[PDB]
Amino acid sequence: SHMPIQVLPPQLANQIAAGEVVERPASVVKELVENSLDAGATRIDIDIERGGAKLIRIRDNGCGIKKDELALALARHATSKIASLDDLEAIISLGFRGEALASISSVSRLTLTSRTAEQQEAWQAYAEGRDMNVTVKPAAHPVGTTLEVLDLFYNTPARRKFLRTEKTEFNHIDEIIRRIALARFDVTINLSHNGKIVRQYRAVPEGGQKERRLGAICGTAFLEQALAIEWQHGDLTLRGWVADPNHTTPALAEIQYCYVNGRMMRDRLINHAIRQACEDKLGADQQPAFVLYLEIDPHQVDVNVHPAKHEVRFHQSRLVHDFIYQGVLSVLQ
Amino acid sequence: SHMPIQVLPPQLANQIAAGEVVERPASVVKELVENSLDAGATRIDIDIERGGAKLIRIRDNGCGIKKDELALALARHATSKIASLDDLEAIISLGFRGEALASISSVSRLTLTSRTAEQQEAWQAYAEGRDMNVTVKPAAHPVGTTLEVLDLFYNTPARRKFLRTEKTEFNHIDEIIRRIALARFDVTINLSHNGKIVRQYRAVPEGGQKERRLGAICGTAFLEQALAIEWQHGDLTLRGWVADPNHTTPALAEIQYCYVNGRMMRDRLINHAIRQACEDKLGADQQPAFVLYLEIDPHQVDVNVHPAKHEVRFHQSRLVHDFIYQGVLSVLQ
Ligand SMILES: Nc1ncnc2c1ncn2[C@@H]1O[C@H](COP(=O)(O)OP(=O)(O)NP(=O)(O)O)[C@@H](O)[C@H]1O
Ligand SMILES: Nc1ncnc2c1ncn2[C@@H]1O[C@H](COP(=O)(O)OP(=O)(O)NP(=O)(O)O)[C@@H](O)[C@H]1O
Ligand SMILES: [Mg+2]
Ligand SMILES: [Mg+2]
């Protein structure tokens, strides 16, 4: 009662939000790359310096951002991905909060450069001060977008403390890119660290062999034990690969990549079903190895549960669980 | 690119936020009770109808809300608990986002009634419409506050679907109150369902016997196996009770209540330390039974990690883990 109820200064409000969506450099990468994907990008180039605490640069050949919308992209609660509750209940894009960029710009030096196919001119924008004022200026840039995030946490001392070693932080980034690359085989992704290319996943052409990228990402060992899954029932569909439990190793078990309508996701319900199918087939229970993709009617899954979309909730939980169980169990025999 | 980047209508922006902090009636109870606690409340009366999907009423004898701040309490990003980054990095209150009430009012019919010790007059406020307009009107009410939340999710169809049975939903509420009652022995809490009292935890007086409430909440079985802990090192301090592992049952293992600076918390780091201490003492590894309280310098723990504060991150992780380990291991011998 001593302190009056008072609206929070813009920057601080954004920093509170950033603490919930941006835990480390890999988080910034996750959010920016998903934006590139939502933008229709086919090629995404990522440059990281000193694990990301120094610089994170992401360029894509997506549709770009119109000059008159640059500031809006840095504003709070502003998005082009949804505009109604109906849109929210039927999410068909990675983003929908209209918050990621504003959140990130409050805890770093973020620069947005972009040009659309209809523009001959490219522009650049960035926010500053307690009020997060945006300035827009001329720039050179092909069709698409570039995001530059520098000095992550330079203005938030306590959080910068949590940063691990350059190697460790980059490793999480590499793992994040790993998961994203497997979600979209039709997208080329290049990752560099301190001026050196660490990896490049070329997009898989039409009907091309997906095994190629799968093997390039998860390893030949997984590929040799990978059992293809094709299971469907109405809106529900399960695709991907599950390693034979009898030939799964602790190292392979490190591959437990799951997707729900293309979004990377770690769900206890799903993992339980998978493991149960393997347990009921194999002799004992263990950690399965898999890269699975669940496609389901957006109305049947709640994705508005975690600010970073790290969780989901299925309406017909028991049903979905049995679907995956049967699907996996089916292939194990 | 087809849809313009556009600021989200107020109500919808709040509904997106509500999806991340309010998963069910018990969540609404959690947020409102923590407000009552932050307000210095000594007695909190909770009335629930039909598991909370119909009505949730919480009254407290806290300090109240000044008439001219009623609207602000329903506004977004507005709080009296912090005002700077320094305040955020040294959290000493349950709330700090200035968002809970606004979020909840967007997905229910929420009414706020309150009067401060300096006011002879009491007032009532509530928000409405896509823009969340607030109206303030006269009311009768003692010193303190009352929150009324009706028809939870009446305007969000997909989410209302996730509601379980009246019994189930109330059960989560009861469990939430359980955890909160154990955090503050100095607070009286009464819980009723459909017009009937289900429980009432009278506050424990000065130096009074805490065992009383502990036994009333966790059961005599826990109390008979409860081993008191007193372990400290600088800012770090571990207090509470841990059941003898050799005499812990699956039923008792249901009691794994942990607190960090008074805030209920489920942390993997902490649970790991506890279990390890029990494992290293006992013969095998299992689920321990405990009600422990960790007090630590706010600067040493990040509580700005989850919108509902369901998680924390310790800066000196290895250290804290060893502190708890030693603390528990110490008593087991
Ligand atoms: N790489 C990009 N290419 C094209 N448009 C982009 C890109 N990144 C961001 N945008 C635009 O900027 C707006 C989004 O900023 P952002 O802060 O990421 O919110 P969001 O994607 O709408 N939702 P969320 O990610 O859930 O907060 C988007 O809605 C797009 O219109
Ligand atoms: N029961 C209460 N008694 C007195 N003041 C209250 C009570 N509930 C809410 N308030 C006031 O209303 C403002 C808070 O609304 P709320 O939306 O719960 O945000 P918060 O508690 O500030 N932060 P957070 O809970 O993290 O969103 C508080 O900061 C208090 O000033
Ligand atoms: Mg986004
Ligand atoms: Mg609050």
CB contact under 8 A, A12 and B69: no
Question: How many angstroms separate the CA atoms of B279 and B276, rounded?
Answer: 5
Distance CA A134, CA B202 (A): 54
Phi-psi region of A98 (alpha: psi -120 to 50; beta: other; left: phi over 0): left
Q: How many CB atoms lie within 10 A of CB B165?
A: 11
Ligand 2 atom 18 nearest Cα: B100
Total count of residues recorded for chain A: 333
What residue's CA is closest to ligand 1, atom 7?
A: A35
Rounded Cα distance, A226 and A247, in Å = 10
Amino acid at the residue B264? M
Q: Is B64 in the pocket of ligand 2 (CB under 6 A)?
A: yes
CA nearest A200: which of A43, A57, A34, A60?
A43
**Does the beta carbon of B54 lie inside 6 Å of ligand 2?**
no
Q: Residue A117 and residue A107: Cα distance in Å, rounded?
A: 31
Chain B positions touching A96 (Cβ under 8 A) are 16
Amino acid at the residue B95: G
Q: What one-character DSSP code corresponds to residue B200?
A: E
**What are the residues whose beta carbons fall under 8 Å from the beta carbon of A68, sequence distance 6 or more?**
none
- Among left, alpha and beta (phi > 0; psi -120 to 50; other), residue A52 is left
What CA–CA distance (Å, rounded) separates A299 from A235? 10
Q: Which residue has the tokens 């004992």?
A: A284
CA distance B40 to chain A (A): 9
Fill in the amino acid letter for A45: D
Place of tokens 């509500």: B18
Q: Å from B252 to nearest chain A CA?
A: 24
Q: In the numeric block, which tokens belong to residue A201?
A: 């996943």
Please name the amino acid found at residue B265: M
In terms of domains, do B162 and B115 share one? Answer: yes
Which chain A residues touch B40 with a CB distance below 8 Å? 1
- Confirm or reject: Cβ of B25 under 6 Å from ligand 2: no
Contact A105, A56 (CB under 8 A): no
* Domain end residue (candidates: A218, A237, A265): A218
CA distance A245 to A287: 8
Q: Report which residue type is found at B118.
A: E
Q: Are B214 and B182 in contact (CB under 8 A)?
A: yes
What token pair was written down for A248?
């799964």
A58 lines ligand 1 (CB under 6 A): no
CB proximity A130 to B under 8 Å: no
Q: Which chain B residues in 301-320 lie under 8 Å from chain A, judged by CB atoms?
A: 302, 304-307, 313, 315
For residue A79 and ligand 1, the question of a CB distance below 6 A is answered with: yes
The domain spanning residue A277 has which CATH number? 3.30.230.10
In the DSSP assignment, the letter for residue B93 is S
Write out A239-281 in H/E/C secondary structure. EEEEECHHHCCCCHHHCEEEEECCEECCCHHHHHHHHHHHHHH
Using DSSP bridges, classify how beta strands A55-60 and A43-49 pair: parallel, antiparallel or unpaired.
Answer: antiparallel
Task: For chain B, say whether A225 makes contact (Cβ under 8 Å).
Answer: no
Domain count, chain A: 2
What secondary structure letter does DSSP report for B207?
Answer: T
End residue of a domain, out of A179, A197, A218: A218
Contact at 8 Å (CB) between B244 and B289? Answer: no
- Ligand 2 binding pocket includes B152 (Cβ within 6 Å): no
Spell out the long-range contacts of B208-211 with Cβ–Cβ below 8 A and sequence spacing 24 or more: B210/B185
Backbone angles phi and psi of A314, in degrees to 5: -90, 140
Q: What are phi and psi of A23, to 5 degrees?
A: -90, -30
A192 lines ligand 1 (CB under 6 A): no
Beta bridge partners of A139: A122
Which residue in B11, B14, B15, B20 has the most chain A C-beta atoms within 10 A of its own C-beta, making it the best mutation to test that interface? B20
First-last CA distance in chain B:
66
* Residue B202 DSSP label: P
- Contacts for B36 with CB less than 8 Å, ≥ 6 apart: B44, B58, B60, B62, B145
CA proximity to B293, closest of B228, B243, B249: B228
Q: What is the resolution of this structure in A?
A: 1.9
Ligand 2 contact via B81 beta carbon (within 6 Å): yes
Contacts of A122 (CB under 8 A, 6+ apart): A113, A114, A115, A138, A139, A140, A141, A142
**Residue ending a domain, choose from B179, B201, B218:** B218
My answer on whether B133 and B249 are in the same domain is no
Determine if ligand 1 sits within 6 Å of the CB of residue A98: yes
d(CA A28, CA A47): 13
Nearest residue on chain A to B1, alpha-carbon basis: A63
Please name the residues in contact with A161: beta carbons below 8 A apart, sequence gap of 6 or more.
B315
Residue with tokens 């502003």: A78
What is d(CA B12, CA A306) in angstroms, rounded to the nearest whole number? 16
SS3 assignment, position B150: strand
B149 C-beta neighbours (distance < 10 Å), count? 25
For residue A75, which residues of chain B lie inside 8 Å, CB to CB?
7
Strand, helix or coil for residue B291: strand
Which residues sit with Cβ closer than 5 angstroms to ligand 4, an ion? Answer: B 35, 95, 100
Q: Which residues pair with A212 in a beta bridge?
A: none
Report the C-alpha gap between B244 and B248 in whole angstroms. Answer: 6
Whether A119 and A213 share a structural domain: yes
Residues A268 and A227 in one domain: yes
B149 and B72 part of one domain: yes
Residues of B in contact with A307 (CB under 8 A): 20, 307
The size of chain B, in residues, is 333
Query: Same domain, yes or no, for A115 and A252?
Result: no
Q: Is A140 in the pocket of ligand 2 (CB under 6 A)?
A: no
| Closest ligand 2 atom, residue B63 Cα | 4
Q: What is the 3-state secondary structure (H, E, C) of chain A?
A: CCCCCEECCHHHHHHHHHHHHCCCHHHHHHHHHHHHHHCCCCEEEEEEEHHHCCEEEEEECCCCCCHHHHHHHHCCCEECCCCCHHHHHCCCCCCCCCCHHHHHHCCCEEEEEEECCCCCCEEEEEEECCCCEEEEEEECCCCEEEEEEECCCCCCHHHHHCCCCHHHHHHHHHHHHHHHHHHCCCCEEEEEECCEEEEEECCCCCCCCCHHHHHHHHCHHHHHHEEEEEEEECCEEEEEEEECHHHCCCCHHHCEEEEECCEECCCHHHHHHHHHHHHHHCCCCCCCCEEEEEECCHHHEECCCCCCCCCCEECCHHHHHHHHHHHHHHHCC
The candidate with the shortest Cα–Cα distance to B282, out of B248, B305, B316, B235, is B248
Crossing angle (nearest 10°) for helices B166-183 and B25-38? 20
CA atoms of A221 and B209, how far apart (whole Å):
61
Query: In the structure encoding, which two tokens stand for residue A135, read together?
Result: 């300035």
Which residue type occupies A2? H
Q: For residue B12, what is the nearest residue in chain A, using CA coordinates?
A: A85
Is the same domain home to A213 and A294?
no
Q: Which residues of A touch B123 (CB under 8 A)?
A: none
Yes or no, beta carbons of A19 and B158 under 8 Å apart: no
* Amino acid at site B92: I
Distance from CA of A16 to the nearest CA of B (A): 7
Ligand 1 pocket, A14 CB below 6 A?
A: no
Method of elucidation: X-ray
Provide Rg for chain A, Cα atoms. 21
Q: How many CB pairs under 8 A join A and B?
A: 135
Taking the Cβ of residue A92 and every Cβ of chain B, the question of whether any pair is shorter than 8 Å is answered with no
Contact criterion met (CB < 8 Å) for B88 and A15:
yes
**Beta-carbon neighbours within 5 Å of ion ligand 3:** A 35, 95, 100
The ligand 2 atom nearest the CA atom of B31: 25
Domain that holds residue A134: 3-218
Is the separation of the CB atoms in B208 and B295 below 8 Å? no
Q: Which residues contact B253 (CB under 8 A, 6 or more apart)?
A: B286, B287, B288, B289
Same domain? A212 vs A223: no
Q: Are residues A206 and A223 in the same domain?
A: no
Q: B137 and B73: one domain?
A: yes
- How many whole angstroms from its chain centre is CA B200? 17
Amino acid residing at A289:
A
Kindly report the number of other CB atoms within 10 A of residue B304's CB atom.
22
B332 Cα to chain A: minimum distance (Å): 31
Distance, CA of B113 to chain centre:
21
Q: Which of A313, A329, A316 is nearest to A235 (CA)?
A: A316
Residues B210, B238: one domain? no
Can you say how many angstroms the Cα of residue B11 is from the centroid of all Cα atoms in its chain?
24
Q: Which of B166, B200, B204 is nearest to B184 (CA)?
A: B204
Residue with tokens 């992780």: B317
* Residue among B101, B148, B180, B187 whose CB has most ligand 2 atoms within 8 A, to mutate: B101
Can you tell me the distance from the alpha carbon of B70 to that of B132, in angstroms, rounded to the nearest whole number? 14
**Interatomic CA distance for residues A200 and A46, integer angstroms:** 10
**What b-and-e string marks burial along A191-219, b requiring 16 or more CB atoms within 10 Å of the CB?**
bbbeeeeebebeebeeeeeeeebbbebbe
CB atoms inside a 10 Å sphere around CB A3: 11
Query: Which CATH number is A83's domain given?
Result: 3.30.565.10
B18 with B111, same domain?
Answer: yes
Beta bridge partners of B149: B56, B110
Rounded-to-integer distance, Cα B313 and Cα B190, Å? 32
User: Which residue type, as a one-letter code, is found at position B312?
Assistant: V
Say how far apart CA A17 and CA A162 lie, in whole Å.
Answer: 17
Q: How far is A112 from chain B (nearest CA, A)?
A: 15
Give the integer Cα–Cα distance in Å for B215 and B270: 23
The Cα–Cα gap between B287 and B249 comes to 9
Whether residue A7 and residue B98 make contact (CB cut-off 8 A), yes or no, is: yes
Substitution target from A20, A35, A112, A266 for chain B, most B beta carbons within 10 A: A20
Give the closest-approach CA distance of A236 to chain B in angstroms. 18
What is d(CA A53, CA B299) in angstroms, rounded to the nearest whole number? 21
Give me the residue label for tokens 């190697």.
Answer: A167
Cα gap A201→A224, rounded to integer Å: 20
Token output for B5: 């980047």
CB contact under 8 A, B1 and A80: yes
Q: Which residue has the tokens 């590894």?
A: B285
